[PDB]
Write an enzyme that holds these catalytic residues in place. Sequence first.
Site, PDB file in Angstrom:
ATOM      1  N   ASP A   1      47.789  25.679 -47.257  1.00 27.44           N
ATOM      2  CA  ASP A   1      49.021  24.897 -47.209  1.00 27.44           C
ATOM      3  C   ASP A   1      49.418  24.529 -45.780  1.00 27.44           C
ATOM      4  O   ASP A   1      50.607  24.458 -45.455  1.00 27.44           O
ATOM      5  CB  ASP A   1      50.152  25.644 -47.918  1.00 27.44           C
ATOM      6  CG  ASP A   1      50.409  27.022 -47.333  1.00 27.44           C
ATOM      7  OD1 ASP A   1      49.546  27.540 -46.593  1.00 27.44           O
ATOM      8  OD2 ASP A   1      51.472  27.600 -47.639  1.00 27.44           O
TER       9      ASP A   1
ATOM     10  N   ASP B   1      49.728  40.501 -43.217  1.00 23.96           N
ATOM     11  CA  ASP B   1      50.067  40.116 -41.849  1.00 23.96           C
ATOM     12  C   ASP B   1      51.120  41.043 -41.240  1.00 23.96           C
ATOM     13  O   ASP B   1      51.054  41.361 -40.046  1.00 23.96           O
ATOM     14  CB  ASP B   1      50.543  38.664 -41.816  1.00 23.96           C
ATOM     15  CG  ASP B   1      51.662  38.393 -42.806  1.00 23.96           C
ATOM     16  OD1 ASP B   1      51.617  38.935 -43.932  1.00 23.96           O
ATOM     17  OD2 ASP B   1      52.591  37.639 -42.458  1.00 23.96           O
TER      18      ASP B   1
HETATM   19  O1  LIG Z   1      48.019  34.749 -55.869  1.00 29.91           O
HETATM   20  C1  LIG Z   1      47.765  34.337 -54.736  1.00 29.91           C
HETATM   21  C2  LIG Z   1      48.788  33.887 -53.906  1.00 29.91           C
HETATM   22  C3  LIG Z   1      48.504  33.536 -52.590  1.00 29.91           C
HETATM   23  N1  LIG Z   1      47.203  33.407 -52.190  1.00 29.91           N
HETATM   24  C4  LIG Z   1      46.875  32.924 -50.832  1.00 29.91           C
HETATM   25  O2  LIG Z   1      47.640  33.607 -49.854  1.00 29.91           O
HETATM   26  C5  LIG Z   1      48.123  32.722 -48.863  1.00 29.91           C
HETATM   27  C6  LIG Z   1      49.639  32.849 -48.778  1.00 29.91           C
HETATM   28  O3  LIG Z   1      50.151  31.825 -49.598  1.00 29.91           O
HETATM   29  P1  LIG Z   1      51.709  31.535 -49.875  1.00 29.91           P
HETATM   30  O4  LIG Z   1      52.062  30.289 -49.157  1.00 29.91           O
HETATM   31  O5  LIG Z   1      51.955  31.395 -51.327  1.00 29.91           O
HETATM   32  O6  LIG Z   1      52.566  32.754 -49.260  1.00 29.91           O
HETATM   33  P2  LIG Z   1      53.949  32.474 -48.478  1.00 29.91           P
HETATM   34  O7  LIG Z   1      53.643  32.020 -47.101  1.00 29.91           O
HETATM   35  O8  LIG Z   1      54.701  31.409 -49.178  1.00 29.91           O
HETATM   36  O9  LIG Z   1      54.768  33.706 -48.441  1.00 29.91           O
HETATM   37  C7  LIG Z   1      47.728  31.310 -49.275  1.00 29.91           C
HETATM   38  O10 LIG Z   1      46.743  30.798 -48.408  1.00 29.91           O
HETATM   39  C8  LIG Z   1      47.170  31.440 -50.679  1.00 29.91           C
HETATM   40  O11 LIG Z   1      46.007  30.666 -50.823  1.00 29.91           O
HETATM   41  C9  LIG Z   1      46.184  33.855 -53.009  1.00 29.91           C
HETATM   42  O12 LIG Z   1      45.024  33.840 -52.600  1.00 29.91           O
HETATM   43  N2  LIG Z   1      46.462  34.319 -54.280  1.00 29.91           N
HETATM   44 MN   LIG Z   2      52.325  29.459 -47.423  1.00 32.50          MN
END
Ligand SMILES: O=c1ccn([C@@H]2O[C@H](COP(=O)(O)OP(=O)(O)O)[C@@H](O)[C@H]2O)c(=O)[nH]1
Ligand SMILES: [Mn+2]
Length: 394
Positions: free
Chosen positions: A142, A223
């Site tokens: 994303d 992270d």
């Molecule tokens: O069930 C999941 C949800 C997230 N992701 C990966 O984990 C990363 C974090 O994504 P997300 O944007 O949903 O987390 P946020 O930044 O919104 O907290 C992304 O690259 C997704 O491809 C994944 O592999 N499986």
């Molecule tokens: Mn994200």
Amino acid sequence: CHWADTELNRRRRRFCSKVEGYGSVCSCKDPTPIEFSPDPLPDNKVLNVPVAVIAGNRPNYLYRMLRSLLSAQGVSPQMITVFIDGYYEEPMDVVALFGLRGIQHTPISIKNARVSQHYKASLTATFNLFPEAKFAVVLEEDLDIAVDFFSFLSQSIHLLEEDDSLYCISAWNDQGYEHTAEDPALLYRVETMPGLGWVLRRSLYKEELEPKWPTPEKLWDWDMWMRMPEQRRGRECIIPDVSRSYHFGIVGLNMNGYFHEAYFKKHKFNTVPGVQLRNVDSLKKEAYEVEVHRLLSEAEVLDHSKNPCEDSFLPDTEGHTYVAFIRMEKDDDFTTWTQLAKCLHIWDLDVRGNHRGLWRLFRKKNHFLVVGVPASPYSVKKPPSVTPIFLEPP
Ligand SMILES: O=c1ccn([C@@H]2O[C@H](COP(=O)(O)OP(=O)(O)O)[C@@H](O)[C@H]2O)c(=O)[nH]1
Ligand SMILES: [Mn+2]
């Protein structure tokens, strides 16, 4: 349709026969190019570094992100691998349309623990795919990728190889907002791991992180775990003043529409091609303290009797360097900085941007240094006339 019978259009038929919602890719006339011609990068030091794209079931985001990745200068499509957290059909279809390598993974555990386990599987797979690679670029599905993302990595990757105090290199500056970031040739050291487009050292992963990676029952964010002292261990990462990635994902694990409008929408994104970074070797550990001391000896001390939270705090100028001192009585006393970041309208949820109690940013296109007194080693440059600024939350 009756597109001209070539390999690119046969790839287009199989895709457009199966999925919907991608617009001009499937139109008869006006077909959108699904191959790109990025510019070459002369002397590419990153040409043999594999790129790991982490993806789940967000096929529309992944297609958007891959279009900008394949458009960056000096990109190597053969080194890209897309790791999908599951066996969803549409993400695999998108990877096939661009002709890249895809790897499927059966999901383990739930919520953030499952994101964590996918990362561990993808990083271990990347270094198994290329046994001779010493680094790996990690990209989320994303992110928009800047047109000079690989030019930026090519000029700085040699810092990871020569400086053992470095944790990583990141494309993302947590405090680089549209009104506080200015110079795309500038770099910093920061005491955190920003992620969002970052470089991972193989020895760090294989010898330190992989043996103690959290097991599937622990509801931890990968992270946040990597930012813990037991993992980072006082090391630092290199970041640019102007970010080379942009987070557009509105629907995610921790992301909603409000949080994005409030902390990501206004993040500054570099669009100047082929920027030459300025004096890269000064970012090494001991050379950087030389640079910070040079900066502090040219900075004008500001009137600390005035309101820090308003524009009047700085003279009407462009291009000067100003310094301000704030109260920081221990290595963890971030009370004033957090209140300062809130009224400056930058990241203020958890502390980032600090280097030995120093924060570097821009205000109305002047360089703006903030020093924590008494905790920072740089407190020794505060003149007697300055009483450090203190602000407590209501
Ligand atoms: O069930 C999941 C949800 C997230 N992701 C990966 O984990 C990363 C974090 O994504 P997300 O944007 O949903 O987390 P946020 O930044 O919104 O907290 C992304 O690259 C997704 O491809 C994944 O592999 N499986
Ligand atoms: Mn994200």
